[PDB]
Design a protein around this ligand. Structure first.
Ligand SMILES: *C(#N)C1=N[C]=[C]C([C][N]C(=O)C2=[C]C(C(=O)C([C])([C])C3=[C]C(Cl)=[C]C(Cl)=[C]3)=C(O[C])[C]=[C]2)=N1
Lengths: 201, 10
């Protein structure tokens, strides 16, 4: 269900993120541990042994010492822990102690969903966010050419029938964005769209 | 998306 590790890696590299990309990880992604280059990762909420559950993106901007955590659903940390049994405080601590002279960092995260509740497109939305991040690392969540294509909806409305048109339109815009930007996606488009469909789940 | 940015110190 949803995108494989290799699909995500191929697409993120089509999107120009290869130099920065630490790889597709399970929930044990260790963090941002050395040097001063822009960095990013795609991280599952679950361990590899489970077969995977949900995809998140992380970005690290060394200039500002800002870590971005992008959940396509925009869940809070408390809700990621409750729903997905996923916590990432240890990774942030590790990263701050490795990279920041004052043992601090800034954490920016979404409060809104771009994705329908039954969609299997989370990893693809993560790739789209990472394109925004590597091209506009000081303002990836909104107010850039990539994320301006999507409409965020309050996370608390995720299960409402009133938002389904908006969330489906986001998915259609995601696929058109990927078709413009990714030869991998173009070559496998029908299959990937089936596998990641809005009502898949 | 709307977002929140918080400072975390360790
Ligand atoms: C979203 N939206 C969404 N919807 C449904 C399912 C998923 C999550 N899908 C997967 O995690 C997935 C993972 C893989 C892998 O490559 C494995 C199982 C090897 C894997 C698992 C984890 Cl936790 C981490 C890594 Cl790096 C790799 C699949 O391989 C066929 C398929 C789906 N998201």
């Amino acid at each position: 269900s949803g995108s494989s590790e290799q699909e995500l890696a191929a697409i993120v590299r089509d999107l120009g993120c290869g130099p920065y990309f630490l790889g597709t990880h399970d929930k044990r992604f260790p963090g941002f541990l050395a040097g001063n280059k822009l960095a990013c990762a795609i991280v599952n909420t679950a361990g590899r042994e489970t077969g995977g559950v949900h995809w998140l993106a992380f970005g690290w901007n060394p200039r500002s010492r800002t870590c971005y955590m992008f959940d396509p659903f925009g869940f809070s940390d408390r809700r990621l822990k409750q729903i997905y049994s996923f916590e990432y405080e240890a990774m942030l601590r590790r990263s701050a102690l490795a990279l920041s002279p004052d043992r601090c960092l800034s954490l920016e995260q979404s409060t809104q969903t771009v994705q329908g509740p039954d969609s299997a497109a989370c990893g693809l939305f993560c790739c789209m966010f990472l394109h925004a991040f590597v091209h506009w690392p000081d303002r990836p969540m909104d107010g850039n050419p990539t994320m301006n294509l999507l409409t965020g909806v309050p996370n608390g409305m995720l299960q409402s029938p009133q938002v389904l048109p908006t969330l489906r339109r986001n998915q259609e815009k995601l696929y058109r964005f990927l078709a413009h930007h990714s030869p991998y996606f173009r070559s496998h488009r029908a299959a990937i769209e089936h596998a990641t469909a809005f009502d898949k789940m | 998306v709307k977002s929140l940015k918080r400072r975390r110190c360790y």
